[PDB]
Amino acid sequence: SIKKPQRFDIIAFPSPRNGQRVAKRLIGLPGETVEYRDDTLYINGVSLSEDYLASAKRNVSKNENYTQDFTLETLEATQSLTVPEGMYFVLGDNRPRSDDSRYFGFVKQASVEGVLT
């Protein structure tokens, strides 16, 4: 049973940077806009909670946002309105220590070797 990846699934794939196997969370799917504003995830302008980040967000500060403000247009690595056909936008839960789509750009769907459970 190879499940078709859904949002917030954890997926393993070779890094677009160096080909090293890495695990990241599926955040954006083909056709969608992705935005972070004030530490909240917006997909197609729809606010989505991330209860898996709440525990980590307890050790930051009043000032600091755990994830910086961005759109797919703001990011040097993406420069795009939407996630392209046949591609994913992924982010790591340890956000300030994560090499993810914010920095290595979109991930090819075809290169994903599994959903991780």
Coordinates of C-alpha atoms in Angstrom, one line a residue:
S1 CA 0.0 0.0 0.0
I2 CA 1.9 3.0 -1.3
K3 CA -0.2 5.9 -0.2
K4 CA -0.4 9.1 -2.3
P5 CA 1.2 11.8 -0.2
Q6 CA -1.2 14.2 1.5
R7 CA -0.5 17.5 3.3
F8 CA 1.4 17.2 6.6
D9 CA 2.7 13.7 5.6
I10 CA 6.4 13.2 6.2
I11 CA 8.2 12.2 3.1
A12 CA 11.6 10.9 2.2
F13 CA 13.5 12.0 -0.9
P14 CA 17.0 12.9 -2.2
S15 CA 17.8 16.5 -1.3
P16 CA 17.6 18.9 -4.3
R17 CA 20.8 20.4 -3.0
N18 CA 23.2 17.4 -2.8
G19 CA 21.1 14.2 -3.4
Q20 CA 21.4 13.1 0.3
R21 CA 18.3 11.2 1.6
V22 CA 16.4 13.5 3.9
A23 CA 13.0 13.6 5.5
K24 CA 10.7 16.6 5.4
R25 CA 7.0 17.5 5.9
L26 CA 4.8 18.0 2.8
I27 CA 3.3 21.5 3.1
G28 CA 2.4 22.6 -0.5
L29 CA 0.9 20.5 -3.3
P30 CA 0.7 21.3 -7.1
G31 CA -1.3 24.4 -7.9
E32 CA -1.3 25.9 -4.4
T33 CA 0.0 29.2 -3.1
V34 CA 2.0 28.9 0.1
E35 CA 2.4 31.8 2.6
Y36 CA 3.6 32.3 6.1
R37 CA 2.6 35.5 7.8
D38 CA 3.0 36.1 11.6
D39 CA 4.0 32.4 12.0
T40 CA 0.7 31.1 10.5
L41 CA 0.5 28.8 7.5
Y42 CA -1.7 29.9 4.6
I43 CA -2.4 27.6 1.6
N44 CA -4.5 29.3 -1.1
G45 CA -5.1 32.0 1.6
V46 CA -6.6 29.4 4.0
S47 CA -5.2 29.4 7.5
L48 CA -4.0 26.0 8.7
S49 CA -2.9 25.0 12.2
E50 CA 0.3 23.0 12.9
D51 CA -0.1 21.3 16.3
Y52 CA 3.2 19.6 15.8
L53 CA 5.0 23.0 15.9
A54 CA 3.3 24.2 19.2
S55 CA 5.7 22.2 21.4
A56 CA 8.8 23.7 19.7
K57 CA 7.3 27.2 19.6
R58 CA 7.2 27.1 23.4
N59 CA 11.0 27.8 23.5
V60 CA 11.3 30.9 21.3
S61 CA 10.2 34.4 22.3
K62 CA 7.5 37.1 22.2
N63 CA 9.4 38.8 19.4
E64 CA 10.7 35.9 17.2
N65 CA 8.6 34.1 14.6
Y66 CA 9.6 30.4 14.4
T67 CA 9.1 30.5 10.6
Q68 CA 9.9 33.8 8.8
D69 CA 7.3 35.6 6.7
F70 CA 7.4 34.4 3.0
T71 CA 5.4 33.6 -0.1
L72 CA 6.6 31.4 -3.0
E73 CA 7.3 34.8 -4.7
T74 CA 9.4 36.0 -1.7
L75 CA 11.8 33.1 -1.8
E76 CA 14.9 33.2 -3.9
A77 CA 14.7 29.4 -4.1
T78 CA 11.2 29.3 -5.6
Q79 CA 10.2 32.7 -7.2
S80 CA 6.8 31.4 -8.3
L81 CA 3.1 32.1 -7.7
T82 CA 2.2 28.4 -7.1
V83 CA 3.7 25.0 -6.6
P84 CA 4.4 23.7 -10.2
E85 CA 2.8 20.6 -11.6
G86 CA 4.5 17.4 -10.4
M87 CA 6.3 19.1 -7.5
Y88 CA 6.0 19.6 -3.7
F89 CA 6.9 22.4 -1.3
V90 CA 8.3 20.9 1.9
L91 CA 9.4 22.2 5.3
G92 CA 11.2 20.7 8.3
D93 CA 9.7 20.8 11.8
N94 CA 13.0 22.1 13.3
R95 CA 12.3 25.2 11.2
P96 CA 15.4 27.4 12.1
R97 CA 17.8 24.4 11.5
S98 CA 16.0 23.0 8.4
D99 CA 17.3 23.0 4.8
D100 CA 14.0 22.7 3.1
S101 CA 12.0 24.3 0.2
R102 CA 12.6 27.8 1.6
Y103 CA 16.3 27.3 0.6
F104 CA 16.6 24.4 -1.9
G105 CA 13.4 25.1 -3.8
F106 CA 10.7 22.6 -4.9
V107 CA 11.0 18.8 -4.7
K108 CA 10.2 16.6 -7.6
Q109 CA 7.3 14.3 -6.8
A110 CA 8.9 11.5 -8.8
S111 CA 12.0 11.5 -6.5
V112 CA 9.9 10.8 -3.3
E113 CA 10.8 7.3 -2.1
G114 CA 8.1 7.1 0.6
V115 CA 5.6 8.5 3.1
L116 CA 7.0 7.9 6.6
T117 CA 4.7 6.4 9.3

